Design an enzyme around this catalytic site. Sequence first.
Site, PDB file in Angstrom:
ATOM      1  N   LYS A 131       0.975  -1.067  -0.106  1.00  0.00           N
ATOM      2  CA  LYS A 131       0.123   0.134  -0.133  1.00  0.00           C
ATOM      3  C   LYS A 131       0.824   1.326   0.015  1.00  0.00           C
ATOM      4  CE  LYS A 131      -3.540   2.228   2.477  1.00  0.00           C
ATOM      5  NZ  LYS A 131      -4.869   1.892   3.168  1.00  0.00           N
ATOM      6  N   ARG A 141       2.171   1.532  -3.651  1.00  0.00           N
ATOM      7  CA  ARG A 141       1.021   2.189  -4.550  1.00  0.00           C
ATOM      8  C   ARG A 141       0.938   4.017  -4.248  1.00  0.00           C
ATOM      9  NH1 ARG A 141      -3.975   2.922  -3.232  1.00  0.00           N
ATOM     10  NH2 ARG A 141      -4.003   1.190  -1.335  1.00  0.00           N
ATOM     11  N   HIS A 194       2.608   6.054  -2.491  1.00  0.00           N
ATOM     12  CA  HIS A 194       3.681   6.882  -2.271  1.00  0.00           C
ATOM     13  C   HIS A 194       4.928   7.017  -3.340  1.00  0.00           C
ATOM     14  CE1 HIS A 194       1.517   8.364   1.124  1.00  0.00           C
ATOM     15  NE2 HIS A 194       1.578   7.105   1.674  1.00  0.00           N
ATOM     16  N   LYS A 234      -8.852  11.135  -1.424  1.00  0.00           N
ATOM     17  CA  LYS A 234      -7.599  11.352  -0.292  1.00  0.00           C
ATOM     18  C   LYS A 234      -7.485  12.867  -0.386  1.00  0.00           C
ATOM     19  CE  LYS A 234      -3.720   9.214   1.250  1.00  0.00           C
ATOM     20  NZ  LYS A 234      -2.363   8.410   0.982  1.00  0.00           N
ATOM     21  N   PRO A 235      -7.681  13.573   0.728  1.00  0.00           N
ATOM     22  CA  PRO A 235      -7.371  14.937   0.851  1.00  0.00           C
ATOM     23  C   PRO A 235      -6.013  15.601   0.312  1.00  0.00           C
ATOM     24  CG  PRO A 235      -8.088  14.369   2.959  1.00  0.00           C
ATOM     25  CD  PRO A 235      -8.028  13.076   2.109  1.00  0.00           C
ATOM     26  N   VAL A 236      -4.848  14.490   0.812  1.00  0.00           N
ATOM     27  CA  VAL A 236      -3.487  15.060   0.668  1.00  0.00           C
ATOM     28  C   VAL A 236      -2.505  13.697   0.518  1.00  0.00           C
ATOM     29  CG1 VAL A 236      -1.339  16.190   1.820  1.00  0.00           C
ATOM     30  CG2 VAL A 236      -3.958  17.337   2.280  1.00  0.00           C
ATOM     31  N   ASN A 237      -1.513  13.802  -0.294  1.00  0.00           N
ATOM     32  CA  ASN A 237      -0.805  12.549  -0.575  1.00  0.00           C
ATOM     33  C   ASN A 237       0.438  13.051  -0.949  1.00  0.00           C
ATOM     34  OD1 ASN A 237      -0.638   9.620  -0.663  1.00  0.00           O
ATOM     35  ND2 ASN A 237      -0.093   9.982  -2.996  1.00  0.00           N
ATOM     36  N   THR A 238       1.655  12.400  -0.697  1.00  0.00           N
ATOM     37  CA  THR A 238       2.884  12.623  -1.254  1.00  0.00           C
ATOM     38  C   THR A 238       3.349  11.614  -1.935  1.00  0.00           C
ATOM     39  OG1 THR A 238       3.498  14.157   0.674  1.00  0.00           O
ATOM     40  CG2 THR A 238       5.318  13.203  -0.622  1.00  0.00           C
ATOM     41  N   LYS A 271       3.716  10.890  14.081  1.00  0.00           N
ATOM     42  CA  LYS A 271       2.651  11.954  14.500  1.00  0.00           C
ATOM     43  C   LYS A 271       1.681  11.276  15.314  1.00  0.00           C
ATOM     44  CE  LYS A 271       3.854  15.576  11.922  1.00  0.00           C
ATOM     45  NZ  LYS A 271       5.200  15.487  12.388  1.00  0.00           N
ATOM     46  N   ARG A 308      -2.468  18.217  -3.216  1.00  0.00           N
ATOM     47  CA  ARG A 308      -3.459  18.304  -2.253  1.00  0.00           C
ATOM     48  C   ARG A 308      -4.636  18.765  -2.937  1.00  0.00           C
ATOM     49  NH1 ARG A 308       1.448  21.170  -0.857  1.00  0.00           N
ATOM     50  NH2 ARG A 308       1.831  20.955   1.162  1.00  0.00           N
ATOM     51  N   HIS A 350       4.111   3.475   6.000  1.00  0.00           N
ATOM     52  CA  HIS A 350       3.547   4.784   6.397  1.00  0.00           C
ATOM     53  C   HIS A 350       3.935   5.992   6.054  1.00  0.00           C
ATOM     54  CE1 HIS A 350       0.468   7.708   7.942  1.00  0.00           C
ATOM     55  NE2 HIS A 350       1.260   8.281   8.819  1.00  0.00           N
ATOM     56  N   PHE A 351       3.345   6.953   5.235  1.00  0.00           N
ATOM     57  CA  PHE A 351       4.194   8.000   4.879  1.00  0.00           C
ATOM     58  C   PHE A 351       3.741   9.207   6.052  1.00  0.00           C
ATOM     59  CE2 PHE A 351       6.753  10.737   2.135  1.00  0.00           C
ATOM     60  CZ  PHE A 351       6.466  12.145   2.566  1.00  0.00           C
ATOM     61  N   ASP A 352       4.547   9.548   6.938  1.00  0.00           N
ATOM     62  CA  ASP A 352       4.417  10.308   7.925  1.00  0.00           C
ATOM     63  C   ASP A 352       4.167  11.672   7.668  1.00  0.00           C
ATOM     64  OD1 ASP A 352       3.166   9.908  10.572  1.00  0.00           O
ATOM     65  OD2 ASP A 352       5.012  10.674  11.524  1.00  0.00           O
TER      66      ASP A 352
END
Length: 119
Positions: free
Chosen positions: A7, A10, A12, A36-40, A61, A80, A114-116
């Site tokens: 995941k 996929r 990030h 998804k509201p924000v992703n990098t 976080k 965003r 997880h992208f933190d």
Amino acid sequence: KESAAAKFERQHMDSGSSNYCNLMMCCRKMTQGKCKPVNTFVHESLADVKAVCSQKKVTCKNGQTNCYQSKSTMRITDCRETGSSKYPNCAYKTTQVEKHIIVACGGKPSVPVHFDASV
């Protein structure tokens, strides 16, 4: 069922245009069910990103301590949701930047799950 490691890849990784986020958020399935509201996305090799798991330890976080910060800045793109975005017609602002990434790592071998944050 997709693993947490799969995941993360996929959502990030894009190892390598204003519409970049609109195309990628769709192709990577982050506009299914909701926007998804924000992703990098990270444009470094998967190997360099996995190596972060053996770099600087920092707090997550959510308070967990299995997070790591990249020793160097990396080429990333932040996506965003725009004010006009409204599911199922999602819309994103694409911003390219060079920042450090912080990821949570887990599993054996320990890999990003997880992208933190970007810092």
